Each structure stands twice: as C-alpha cells, then as structure tokens.
Amino acid sequence: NLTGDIVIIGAGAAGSLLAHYLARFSNMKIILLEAGHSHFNDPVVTDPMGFFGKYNPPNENISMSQNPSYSWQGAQEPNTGAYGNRPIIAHGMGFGGSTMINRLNLVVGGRTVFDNDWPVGWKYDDVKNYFRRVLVDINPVRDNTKASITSVALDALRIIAEQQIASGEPVDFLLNKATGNVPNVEKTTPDAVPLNLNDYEGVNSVVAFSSFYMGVNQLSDGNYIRKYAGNTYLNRNYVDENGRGIGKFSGLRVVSDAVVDRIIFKGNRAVGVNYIDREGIMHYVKVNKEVVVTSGAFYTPTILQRSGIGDFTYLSSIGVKNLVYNNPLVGTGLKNHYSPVTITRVHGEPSEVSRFLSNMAANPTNMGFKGLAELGFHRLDPNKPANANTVTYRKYQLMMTAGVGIPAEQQYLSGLSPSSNNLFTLIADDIRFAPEGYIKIGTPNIPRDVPKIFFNTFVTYTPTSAPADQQWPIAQKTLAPLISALLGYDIIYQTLISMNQTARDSGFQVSLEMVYPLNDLIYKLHNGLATYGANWWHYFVPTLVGDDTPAGREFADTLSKLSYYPRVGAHLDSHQGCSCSIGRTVDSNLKVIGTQNVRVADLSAAAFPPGGNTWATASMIGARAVDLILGFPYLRDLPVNDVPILNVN
Amino acid sequence: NLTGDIVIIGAGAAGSLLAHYLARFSNMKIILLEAGHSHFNDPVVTDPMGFFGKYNPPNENISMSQNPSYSWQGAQEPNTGAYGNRPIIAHGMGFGGSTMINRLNLVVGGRTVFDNDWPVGWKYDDVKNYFRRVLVDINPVRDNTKASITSVALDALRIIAEQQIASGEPVDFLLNKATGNVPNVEKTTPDAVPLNLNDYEGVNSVVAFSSFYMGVNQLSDGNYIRKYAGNTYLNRNYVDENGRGIGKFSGLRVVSDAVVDRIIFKGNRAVGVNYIDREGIMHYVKVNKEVVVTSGAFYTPTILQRSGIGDFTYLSSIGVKNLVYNNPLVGTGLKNHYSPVTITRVHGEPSEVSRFLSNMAANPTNMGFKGLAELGFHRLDPNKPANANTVTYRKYQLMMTAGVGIPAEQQYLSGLSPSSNNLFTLIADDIRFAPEGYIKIGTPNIPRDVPKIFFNTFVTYTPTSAPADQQWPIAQKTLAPLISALLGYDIIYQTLISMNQTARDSGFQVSLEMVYPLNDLIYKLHNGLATYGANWWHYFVPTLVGDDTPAGREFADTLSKLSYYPRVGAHLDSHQGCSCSIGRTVDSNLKVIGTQNVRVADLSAAAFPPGGNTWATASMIGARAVDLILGFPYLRDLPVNDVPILNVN
Ligand SMILES: Cc1cc2nc3c(=O)[nH]c(=O)nc-3n(C[C@H](O)[C@H](O)[C@H](O)COP(=O)(O)OP(=O)(O)OC[C@H]3O[C@@H](n4cnc5c(N)ncnc54)[C@H](O)[C@@H]3O)c2cc1C
Ligand SMILES: Cc1cc2nc3c(=O)[nH]c(=O)nc-3n(C[C@H](O)[C@H](O)[C@H](O)COP(=O)(O)OP(=O)(O)OC[C@H]3O[C@@H](n4cnc5c(N)ncnc54)[C@H](O)[C@@H]3O)c2cc1C
C-alpha cells in the first residue's frame, strides 16, 4: 500500500543524523523507523538532572535505564569470571536512541587509536573533520565552579609526572611523547588556559585536565536543558508532529512506535521491511536503493541473523526458514569497557575537612564529574603493543566524584555508609579491556530483549601437565584484566601518596588514606611489586613459582585476596560495541560481506573500542556513512558555522 | 481460513490437560497454541538427571532455566529488600511449560489452606477428586536409597515433638490435631511403614516423613524418564509430528512455535486471535465459543492488559488503542515462595564422618531431596491467624541435601568450599511468604520477555515521632518475613541440637553444628529469644524501646547483623502465581469480570499459594476448568483405572 526509497532502522545516535543529512542533500525518499517515541516533554529526560532520579515516583524510584518503558533490557548469560552474576545492559528507546539516558559526557578517543588499530581509510586524518563537525554540532560546555581538591590533585599529578620524567623510563602512564619534556598538566594559576582533550590536532593523549564536555545548554530563563541526537536533528523545526518533513525536508517521513523483525529478500537484494505497530499489524514498504541497520550493538546482529545471514548450522537448528549467506563471524568479538571504584577517607578536624571537601555538588554542567586525567600504560604491565615504547596509548581514564558509589552490599560489608560526608571516591576506568564475547539469536519469531550474550571477564587460569615455558604466554593472555585492575589500584595509591604532601603544603591540614580496599593490603601489594619487579604477575599461580618463603606465600595470598574486589566492587559501563566489526562482517565501505545493498552504520560496525566514551564515534560513523552513500565529501567540506537550529517546542 | 470453537493459549501444566480432556470428552475441535516445540528426544529434558547439567557443551555450561531457547527471562526491577538486586525467574517454553525444567517434586499442599483461604466451591472436599486424579495420572515414585542420617533426624524430630506435646502449649510447629497426643513422626524401625504426606483424607498437615514423591518412571532398560504434562497428554499416541489428532481426538490440533499477541473483540465478545509464527507472519483464526488464557503467572496479566482489559489510566498513558473494562486489579498481588539456606559442619574422626555422611548421592528418583518434614507456626511468632487454636497451619518445608547450595560469593567469603566432604545443608522453606507485588507492561507492541515486575521482600521499618502504641501494628505488619526467617533459623538450630544427642545415642561418635550462619550469632539469638519471649521482635527498632542495657545493646546488634544472611544467602523459588486471583479478576466460574467467554486456567488464577510446591495445583485448576466448561463432572466420574499411556518416542 506504501512505497519508499531509503529506510533506516533505529533513530539512535547515528540513525537520526544519517536521516537528517540524507534528507538535506538528496531529492529521493528517506524513511526512518524507530521502536520508541519522542520524549520532548518529560522532566526526567529533558532536564539533565532528571537522570539522577529527581522526578521519580516515591514507589517506583528506578533509573531511566532500568525502565522497560525507556530502554531494552539486555540480560546476559552468567559470567563465569564474575561469580555467576548476570548484569543487565540497556539500549534506550525513542528518538535519540541511547543518548536520551546517558551521562551526556563527550570525548573523542585520541589519534593513536584511530591510526594504529583501525584499517586503512579510517585513519585519524580522514575522520578528524567528522569529529570536529559532530563536536561543534553538539556544542558542549564546561564546568562552572572550581573545587580546591582538583587543584591539589593536578599539582600532585604534576609532581608525579616530573618525577617520572627525571627517572627516565621507556614508557609510563603519565608520559606524552607528542609534547616533549614538559608534562601535559594544567597549571594551578587562576588564569591557566584549559587543556582541551578533544583538540583538532590530537596533541593530547595523556593529559591532566579539570573539566569534561557535556551536551548541556543553558536557556534564556536560567535553567539548563539536555541536548542529544533527537532534540538536535529531529525537532519540530524539521519534522512536524505528524511525522513528516516540512518545507525543505518534504521528502522525509518518520514513523514512531515501529519495531521491525524481518527483511524481505530476492536472493541478494532486500525487497522490503515489515514492522509491528501498537495495534499489531505488519505493513509492507518497498525498498528501491538501499537499507541501513543502526539498531545498536546488541540488536544489529539479531536482525541480521533473523533475516537469513549468519551461521547456517545454527540458524537451521533453531528453525530459521530462509537462508541467504553463510558467515560464522556475525555477532562475534563484542567489546566493552569496565570501571572499578575506590574510596578514600580524609582525617583531621571537622572545619578543615568541611572546607576541603566542598564545591563538588552535582550541577547540570559537571554531571558530578570532577575529572583528573587520562593516563597511559603502566611500566610494569606485561601486555603492551609493539609501539608502546615509541607512541603513547590511552589505557586508563581517571575520574573522581563526591560521595560513595558502590552497591549497598559492599557498603554494609565494609561499613562505609554514605552518611559520612568526609570521604570521596575515584574511578580508574579501563579503556583497553581485553575480554570479548559474542551474540546469538534464540528464537526466530519476534525481536526479544534477551538474546544469548556471553561475556566472561575475570577468568582464572588452571595449570596443565605441560612445561612452564609453554604455559606462561597463555597465563599472560588470560590474566590481563586482573593485572590491569591491580595496576590501576597502584596508580591511585601513588596519586594519594603524592596528594598527601601536596595538600599538606597547599595550606590544608588534612591526612588522606585509602579505606575501601583495606589500604594495608594496598601497601603490601606496593611493597611486593617493588621487591619483585616485572615478574610480580608470576605469583598469580603459586604452584608454578614454587617459592615457599613466608614473603612469597603472603604476597600470593594478598594477590589472590585483592582479586575479589574488581569482580563485585565495580560497575560495568554500557559502552558495548564491535559486533559487526570492519574486516569480519563488513568491508571498509560499510557493506556486509556477501550482500549487495545493505549497510551497518552504528557502534557495532566499529573495528575497535575508542579510548573513552563512545558517542561521538557513533555519530562520526553515521556521518561517514552519509558521505559513502552520497559519494561526495559534503560533510567534510561544509562550513563550520552552519549548524542545525535548536527548537525546544 | 483456520477456524475453531474453543481456543486455548499456552501449553503449560494446565493447557495440555485441558486440551486433552476436551478432545477426549467432546467432539468440538480444539486448537492449542504454544510458543515452543516438542522436546521428546532431547536427552537434557528427557533424562531426569539432565536437570543438573550433564548434557551441556563445556563452553556453554548453563542450566535450562537460564537458556533463552528453553524459557523466558523474567528480570524484575530492583527490590529495596535485597540491596537492589534483580533476580531473574524463568517460565518454561514448549510442551509442558515450566514442568520441562522443574525438579518434578510433587506436593498437594494440605487441607486447611484450601478450606480457610479459598472461596466457596473451592474447598478441600471439592478438589480432593481432582488432586487424586492428577496424582494417579502422574503416578510418582519414592526414594530408593536409605540414609543413616535420615533415621537420626527422624528420631530427633520425634523427641522434639514429644517435648512440645508434653509442654502443652496452644500452638507449635511440631503439633498436629488430626492425630491427637501422638507425634506424627515416621518410625525408625527397620520395618517402618511409609508416612505419605499427600494422603487422600488430608489428615496429614504437620508430618515428619522420610521421602518426597517425584514424577519419574523406571523403564525396562533400567533408566528413569522425566514424566511431565507434555509426554503424558501430548505424546505421539494422540498427536503426531504434524500435530493432528489420532482417532477420537481428530478434533484436536496443536500448533508449535506460535506466539500470540492480542485478543480482538466486538464490544463484549471475542472474535479471534492472532499469532506470529516461525516465518514472522500474522495469522487470524476465527473464534466461535470460548477462549481460555493460561500463559502463566507472569504473562497472563500482560496479555490481559495488552488485550484491552485493565487499568484505563496506565494503559492509556502507555498508548493502548482499545479500552474495554476498567479493572485496577489486573496483575495485582503477586505471591511467591522463598528459601534461606544453612550449612552445618560435622566434627570427628575422619572414618566416622565418612561413614556418617554416606548414601546422600543424588539419583533420578530423589533429586537430592532426602526430605525431613513440613512444620507449622513457631510459638514465638507475633503473627498467627484467628484459627491458630482451632486448626493447624503449615508454614515451613524443611529439607536436607548433601553438598553446599549457596552462590559462590558467600562460599568465598566464609571459606566453606564444596570440595570439603563434611558439610551438608538444611533448608527452611517458607510456604507462607507475606510480601506481594504487581505486574505492568511497558510497550504495547509485542509480547516482551521482561515486563515491569515489582517485588520487595525484606523491607525495614521507618520510625516516626509518635507514641509507639499506635505504631506497633504497622511495624508488626512490615517486619513479618524477617521474623519468619529468624524463627526458621531457630527451628533448625534446635533440630540440630537434638540431632547431636540422637546421633550420639545411635552409635555415631560425631559432633556437629552449623557454621555458615555464624553459630555464635544464632546462639545469641536463641538466648535472646528465651530471655525476651514475645518482646524479642521489638528490638528491630532500638530507638523506640531503648534501654541502654548491655544485654539490650548486644541483642539489638546481633538482630541487626543476623538480617544480612536472609538477604544474601537465599534463592527465590519460582513458585510465583496468584496475580489474577478469584474475587479480583474472575468469579467462581473462572470467568473474567466484564466479559462473556474469556477464562483464565493457570496458577495465576489461584486465590492463595498452596502450602508447598505448586505443580499439582495448576493441573487441578485445569481439570476444574474442564468440568466447568463441559457442565458434567466427567473427571469426577472417570474411573481411576483410566490413565493415558506414555510414549517415550
Ligand atoms: C546508561 C548509559 C550511559 C552512557 N553514558 C555515556 C557517556 O557518558 N558518554 C558516551 O559517549 N556514551 C555514553 N553512553 C553510550 C551512548 O548512549 C550510546 O552508546 C550511543 O547512542 C551509541 O549509539 P547507538 O546507535 O548504539 O545508540 P542506540 O540507542 O543503541 O541506537 C539504536 C536505537 O535504535 C532503536 N532500535 C533498536 N532495535 C530496533 C528495532 N529492532 N526496531 C526499531 N528500532 C530499534 C532503539 O531506539 C535503539 O536505542 C551511555 C549509554 C548508557 C546506556
Ligand atoms: C527451576 C524451577 C523449579 C521448579 N520446581 C518445582 C518443584 O519442585 N515442584 C513444583 O511443584 N513446582 C516446581 N516449579 C514450578 C512449576 O514448574 C510451574 O510453576 C508449574 O508447571 C506451573 O505451570 P503453568 O502452566 O501454570 O506455568 P508455565 O509452565 O509457565 O505455563 C506457560 C506456558 O504458556 C506458554 N506461553 C507463555 N507465554 C505465551 C504466549 N505469549 N503465547 C503462547 N504461549 C505462551 C509457555 O511456553 C508455557 O508452555 C519449578 C519451577 C522452576 C522454574
């Protein structure tokens, strides 16, 4: 009954941008289908502080990610490395996709990752313009206030950096070789210029700064608003209430509350897509040129497999009727970030600790983030790439906030309840997280919130009856995440050690000591690390070492005991991706291998996790897909000053 | 073009029975729709020992409940009682429903529950016939191997019952009134008679027995077979591979791999239903006489709300197009069971402890359930109904099993590894669980695996500035499950203290005590119970009854500390139901209020959870529905010697 030319699945962080820009530069028809609906008039989502649970009913106070009305519930299979727990990860619904419910933080990832870990045609010098376009389209803002603790932390970081430069090691977490001998630490003078970590050139990869960039804008009244993909590209100024373009965009139509399940085929060419609406009737729309799937990391492999592309044996076993192309790589090698936490309690008298722990209240500009730096590889990490000693890589993202963020079980077990106001927290996020998994469809009837998702993070090692030299590489490969977590803990401990003297000489009379990981254990870890050198990680398996002295046995016991904290005392960030990576499921032209006219243009199609948060990356992939579909580098050569017009209502 | 007279939705524990006895006793064609498909030949479901995970790939070692191809994933919203945890409860898929993945334990429930907590027409003397029919049709078997510890436990229970009956207290857990002054404990003599707890007359309410009843059958080879509703009522004898009736059953037709979405109407009369098949197509089938929904506890209210019956405000807010009946009760009051776990350590010479703990290996006839008893209310329970001194109520279901059943986190924390061979578990089940919740849908597009499910278990009390005289009833109402759990812990403690003497007298020179609940803490709990009597539970709020007495401080501290284990060390049993009970949504005819020919025939329609495992109740309700639909008590007049024949292949 209907017809069309281009249909896009998922008005997310890339789908909305792609639809808007296809409508901008073309006369053909573009259709956008989205599972959810617009939420332009909700204080929970429109207000940035609504993410924190401000407009929630007293009997249903749950976050936006935990509402089935807002996001898909992606429960996973038990994690054998995490005591069998089943964390749930969510993808948002409606216009704007998952950007509706995020923390609104914006980063780029750096220049090294896009040059040494991506295929040709996707180096930094080809996507810097797209990064700039997206960043100036969102137009973030920085923090308003300036806490005293941030200056002390930056000074301590500068002291650590100068000590490391004086030592002269081949590679350290606080060394940047693109700037020379001078450390990349912002100065404490009131007139110090900000160290922008999303600079166009890419000089900063290991930089100590003081504020992130959030997609928040201030209105004329004086209250802040949340800016995301939906309220940037899909406002009433472009698409009306009916769901059709107005004036210049007359060729664009968007249907909301539409979920697709299957793609009609002709052997290699998609002939139509069917969707399910609120009343439950499936309609048929013709496809003339191409289709793009932008349903996210978890639901692009699912629609691909249910369409008839994937491992033939599995699809035939589960009863998939139509089979088109055979590929055992679909939905494989899923990557995600992971961030442990730590708590530090200050001592002294109430006046000084009150005047020192102030001005970190959450406001819509900092989102509770103070931020310290984005460090590199630790010197004693066994697993570094070849270019580690020559080119710096982003390994850790350091964050600090106020209060305590921990699940209540560990709060009760440790006894550090949030009643006390004399303690803060730090998060050493890991952007080089090693373990990967895969996604498989369960039943070929309807889209479902839970496919088969396997993700084993902190897996231990069992020795075999083999020579030790043949086992050590396998232990090195397997035991990477534990080493990374321990190195992050040691980094934070060194930061605290420097911060003690920095705060003592900065005019404050306080003493800072680690509390949550039982700082005596951290001290034992530091002593063992210093005494044992680079072979410290050999004591993960005491039997292979064979040492029986009390020092070695207690070091082994402490190392085993410290492995308990990252498994439960941490959080799993929702930065999943790389399920249809380039070179395995798709080529560098964003085309699936063996298909003719389908594309994937979301974070799933990425070939590697960026060195940080993953929003601008998805937006860039969408824009580059626009250029590849058109063939002309329109978005690369567009003037910077031309941006879409905001329209609140 | 496909049509039928009566359409049944959901081939669960009751739909299969209803369809079978509809085809047997009538000529009208019956159509059954099920989401899954037959698993007759799968060794994982057919072999009773396959429930424990014997036929799974080494790289996908997950149980049948956690596998999306076998069961739906019922992730619930976080509960403030369990530190915001989100346990997942699974409903089975395919022929037989959840009976495919259960432990097959069969318990009737008792007499008093069906007579005091159920309406007229659903009393015990009206459902005994159907309970007997179900038990005869399944034909369970008893245990094979006899354990020496079972006799010791039975003698200890007999001694405790003798003490309780000599004390002459008005009510206690080990007192029964259908027997008199003689304890209802099975004899320990070698020629003892089995003490059946599912007797026809229902005189058995508090019984100390030695073996449960499991739905397994021995074959000629010598191996057992899981006997559930699927192979019993829908085997190859009556329905072939193509799902058409054989002989008299020619009217019946069963379509596998069918997911129903909504029920169309004409103002007060349903006309047809639609389902999404394997090829993702919509099929419309005409309805002539009746439609019955038995989709389960979690998915009956969801389908009812998505159909057009339920709260108008919430459905209209979500976006449901059609509204029929304004019932604010659809999906209200969800009841489910609970089960804390304890661990006991046996001290002594290694040969003694090896000889004592023999013959507790799991078999396809006992499933590790040695079985102890079903107990009543504790004498110190603040909450007891009116008929406490008139009739006996069963509150607990005590069971014993070898090994340690606890999530691995607490195993690591306490150091009670399963590798040790001197520990066993005592489980104090709770069949009278107080708290309840509700079910709400999230998006009116497709039947989703995860709806909005709220269930808060262990909620604390908030003191208010007022005299405690008008505050105590509210605190008593709110603090019921904690009291029940602590009373069960005390029951297990005194059962163990009698176990010690009985084992010493029985020629076993072994000392034994509990470890996991921190035996000193439970000893302090028992001392405080004895000291304070009925005022023991007033110390959950130390502010309201503060005394500054060192004994008072110790009691308050040990009561606060003991509340952690029920929160962490327990498993939510999947006995959920009663969310669409009789008197709220349906009448005595099990007909939906405000409709004409809509009926519910599952466990969700139960007015109260039975005192035990809930497999038989669903089939009982299905048989009642058959009798109500037909109009003649055929199943009440069917001779016992008529049983359907099972077909292994
Ligand atoms: C709690 C949370 C916090 C985050 N914080 C940050 C942060 O601070 N910084 C950062 O950079 N990133 C952050 N992210 C990540 C960011 O929100 C997303 O990763 C980003 O939107 C990536 O783009 P996407 O296309 O994957 O988005 P998606 O939302 O995954 O886009 C796909 C969308 O398409 C729709 N869709 C899916 N399947 C179907 C279907 N079958 N039919 C129809 N429509 C469908 C849905 O609306 C879905 O959301 C956060 C994410 C979460 C969940
Ligand atoms: C792990 C586990 C252990 C258990 N152990 C015991 C035990 O020892 N003793 C005991 O008495 N009970 C036990 N139970 C409970 C017992 O298995 C069930 O509660 C009982 O069979 C209830 O049956 P039901 O048909 O009402 O529910 P279900 O079995 O959940 O019935 C639902 C049926 O309808 C189908 N269906 C659902 N939604 C749709 C839809 N939209 N369209 C079409 N079809 C649909 C499903 O595929 C399924 O066949 C256990 C349950 C679990 C999960």
Report domain extents, chain B: 1-142+213-336+433-455+574-649, 143-212+337-432+456-573
Let me know: does B47 contact B221? Beta carbons within 8 Å.
no
Instruction: Assign 3-state DSSP to chain A and report helix, strand, coil percentages, each to 5.
Output: 30, 20, 50
Residue A300 corresponds to which tokens in the numbers above?
């692009």
Question: Which positions in chain A touch B257 (Cβ < 8 Å)?
Answer: 319, 445
| DSSP structural state of residue A194 | P
Mutate to test the interface with A, among B307, B409, B462, B562 (most CBs of A within 10 A): B409
Let me know: does B227 contact B217? Beta carbons within 8 Å.
yes
Q: Write out the catalytic residue numbers of A.
A: 575
Which residue blocks in B52-147 are alpha helix, DSSP H? 112-116, 124-138
Name the minimum distance, in Å, from the CA of B508 to any CA of chain A. 37
Please indicate whether, in this complex, the C-beta atoms of A452 and B88 are within 8 angstroms of each other.
no
Residue A437 corresponds to which tokens in the numbers above?
């998994």
Closest to A601 (Cα-Cα) out of A7, A25, A18, A4: A18
Collapsing DSSP states into helix, strand and coil, what is residue A577? strand
Angle among Cα A77, B77, B448 to the nearest 5 degrees reads: 65
B53 φ/ψ sector (left φ>0, alpha ψ -120 to 50, else beta): left
Distance CA(B140)–CA(B365), nearest Å, equals: 9
Q: Which of A91, A277, A294, A619 to mutate to test the pocket of ligand 1 (most atoms within 8 A of CB)?
A: A91
Phi first, then psi, for residue A559 (nearest 5°) are -65, -40
The sheet with strand A30-33 has its strands ordered as: A252-255, A30-33, A6-9, A290-293, A598-600
Q: Which ligand is nearest to the CA of A451?
A: 1
β-bridge mates for residue A373, sequence order: A208, A398
A50 Cα: distance to centroid of ligand 1 (angstroms): 18
Distance CA(B19)–CA(B626), nearest Å, equals: 9
Distance CA(B378)–CA(B386), nearest Å, equals: 15
Q: Can you tell me which atom of ligand 2 is nearest the CA of B259?
A: 42
CA max distance for chain B:
80
Let me know: does A101 contact A230? Beta carbons within 8 Å.
no
Residue A471 corresponds to which tokens in the numbers above?
């086992």
Distance CA(A477)–CA(B150), nearest Å, equals: 49
Tell me whether residue A34 is annotated as binding. Answer: yes
Q: Write out the catalytic residue numbers of B.
A: 575
Distance CA(B17)–CA(B287), nearest Å, equals: 21
Distance CA(A287)–CA(A297), nearest Å, equals: 24
Distance CA(B609)–CA(B215), nearest Å, equals: 21
Phi first, then psi, for residue A493 (nearest 5°) are -65, -45
Mutate to test the interface with A, among B283, B448, B452, B456 (most CBs of A within 10 A): B448
Collapsing DSSP states into helix, strand and coil, what is residue A259? strand
| Residues whose beta carbon lies within 6 Å of some atom of ligand 1 | A 9-10, 12-14, 33-36, 65, 90-94, 97-99, 101-103, 105, 259-260, 294-296, 299, 303, 447, 574-575, 602-603, 613-615, 618
How far is Cα of residue A614 from the mean position of the Cα atoms in its chain? 5
B452 Cα: distance to centroid of ligand 2 (angstroms): 19
Q: Which of A33, A131, A283, A295 to mutate to test the pocket of ligand 1 (most atoms within 8 A of CB)?
A: A295
Q: Can you tell me which atom of ligand 1 is nearest the CA of A103?
A: 8
Closest to B323 (Cα-Cα) out of B241, B254, B265: B265
Question: Which positions in chain A touch B445 (Cβ < 8 Å)?
Answer: 35, 257, 259, 276-278, 280
Please indicate whether, in this complex, the C-beta atoms of B443 and A84 are within 8 angstroms of each other.
no
Closest to B74 (Cα-Cα) out of B240, B306, B301: B301
Kindly report the number of other CB atoms within 10 A of residue B523's CB atom. 14
Residue A317 corresponds to which tokens in the numbers above?
């076993």
Residue B321 has its nearest CB partner, among A37, A67, A278, at A278
Please indicate whether, in this complex, the C-beta atoms of B84 and A564 are within 8 angstroms of each other.
no
Which amino acid, A62?
I
Which amino acid, B80?
T
Q: Can you tell me which atom of ligand 2 is nearest the CA of B618?
A: 26
Kindly report the number of other CB atoms within 10 A of residue A551's CB atom. 12
Tell me whether residue A260 is annotated as binding. Answer: yes
Closest to A402 (Cα-Cα) out of A350, A351, A367, A352: A367
Please indicate whether, in this complex, the C-beta atoms of A444 and B280 are within 8 angstroms of each other.
yes
In order of A326, A370, B181, B388, B492, the CA distances from B168 in angstroms are 76, 68, 10, 14, 21
Name the minimum distance, in Å, from the CA of A649 to any CA of chain B. 21
Sign of CA dihedral A353, A354, A355, A356: positive
The alpha carbons of chain B give a radius of gyration, in whole angstroms, of 25
Mutate to test the interface with A, among B77, B93, B306, B449 (most CBs of A within 10 A): B449
Mutate to test the interface with A, among B445, B458, B560 (most CBs of A within 10 A): B445
Distance CA(B410)–CA(B472), nearest Å, equals: 34
Question: Which positions in chain B touch A445 (Cβ < 8 Å)?
Answer: 35, 257, 259, 276-278, 280
Residue B261 corresponds to which tokens in the numbers above?
């979405």
Distance CA(A287)–CA(A274), nearest Å, equals: 11
Strand A437-440 relative to strand A452-454: parallel, antiparallel, unpaired? Answer: antiparallel
Collapsing DSSP states into helix, strand and coil, what is residue A105? strand
Q: Which ligand is nearest to the CA of A104?
A: 1
Name the minimum distance, in Å, from the CA of A91 to any CA of chain B. 14
User: Rounded to the nearest 10 degrees, how much is the dihedral formed by the CA atoms of A244, A246, A251, A252?
Assistant: -40
Residue B190 corresponds to which tokens in the numbers above?
């070698």
| DSSP structural state of residue A72 | E
Tell me whether residue B188 is annotated as binding. Answer: no
Phi first, then psi, for residue A419 (nearest 5°) are -65, -40
Residue B321 has its nearest CB partner, among A86, A262, A279, at A279
Q: Which ligand is nearest to the CA of B108?
A: 2
Closest to A82 (Cα-Cα) out of A393, A367, A457: A457
Q: Which residue of chain A has the CA closest to B315?
A: A278
Tell me whether residue A103 is annotated as binding. Answer: yes
Let me know: does A505 contact A498? Beta carbons within 8 Å.
no
Q: Hey, whose CA ends up nearest to atom 1 of ligand 2?
A: B102
Residue A245 corresponds to which tokens in the numbers above?
């373009």
Tell me whether residue A365 is annotated as binding. Answer: no
Which residue blocks in B8-147 are alpha helix, DSSP H? 15-25, 43-46, 112-116, 124-138
Kindly report the number of other CB atoms within 10 A of residue A463's CB atom. 12
Q: How many CB pairs under 8 A join A and B?
A: 129
B297 Cα: distance to centroid of ligand 2 (angstroms): 8
A319 CB-contact burial (10 Å; exposed 0-12 / middle 13-18 / buried 19+): middle
Distance CA(A225)–CA(A45), nearest Å, equals: 9
In order of A315, B238, B239, the CA distances from B21 in angstroms are 36, 12, 14
Which amino acid, B232?
T
Distance CA(B259)–CA(B306), nearest Å, equals: 14
Tell me whether residue A118 is annotated as binding. Answer: no
Question: Which positions in chain A touch B282 (Cβ < 8 Å)?
Answer: 280-282
Distance CA(A154)–CA(A499), nearest Å, equals: 9
Question: Which positions in chain B touch A454 (Cβ < 8 Å)?
Answer: 60
Q: Which of A102, A431, A573, A590 to mutate to test the pocket of ligand 1 (most atoms within 8 A of CB)?
A: A102
Residue B371 corresponds to which tokens in the numbers above?
């079985």
Residue B446 has its nearest CB partner, among A66, A67, A276, at A276
Distance CA(B305)–CA(B261), nearest Å, equals: 11
Question: Which positions in chain A touch B564 (Cβ < 8 Å)?
Answer: 412
Let me know: does B329 contact B585? Beta carbons within 8 Å.
yes
Tell me whether residue A98 is annotated as binding. Answer: yes
Question: Which positions in chain B touch A77 (Cβ < 8 Å)?
Answer: 60, 62, 66
Please indicate whether, in this complex, the C-beta atoms of A66 and B78 are within 8 angstroms of each other.
yes
Let me know: does A396 contact A374? Beta carbons within 8 Å.
yes
Please indicate whether, in this complex, the C-beta atoms of B446 and A278 are within 8 angstroms of each other.
no
Residue B446 has its nearest CB partner, among A80, A259, A444, at A259
Long-range own/partner contacts, residues B278-285 (CB < 8 A, 24 or more apart) = B278/A319, B278/A321, B278/A444, B278/A445, B279/A321, B279/A322, B280/A261, B280/A262, B280/A274, B280/A282, B280/A306, B280/A444, B280/A445, B280/A446, B281/A282, B282/A280, B282/A281, B282/A282, B283/B2, B285/B2, B285/B3, B285/B4, B285/B7, B285/B31
Distant-in-sequence, close-in-space partners of A434: CB < 8 Å, separation ≥ 6:
A383, A480, A481, A484
Name the minimum distance, in Å, from the CA of A626 to any CA of chain B. 30
Residue A69 has its nearest CB partner, among B83, B277, B442, at B442
Annotated resolution, angstroms: 4.3
Residue B423 corresponds to which tokens in the numbers above?
């520990």
Q: HSE on the CB side for B119, CA within 13 Å?
A: 13
Kindly report the number of other CB atoms within 10 A of residue A368's CB atom. 17
Residue A524 corresponds to which tokens in the numbers above?
């034992």
A2 CB-contact burial (10 Å; exposed 0-12 / middle 13-18 / buried 19+): exposed
Question: Which positions in chain A touch B83 (Cβ < 8 Å)?
Answer: 407-409, 412
The alpha carbons of chain A give a radius of gyration, in whole angstroms, of 25
In what helix (H) or strand (E) does residue B301 lie, and over which residues does it extend? helix B300-307
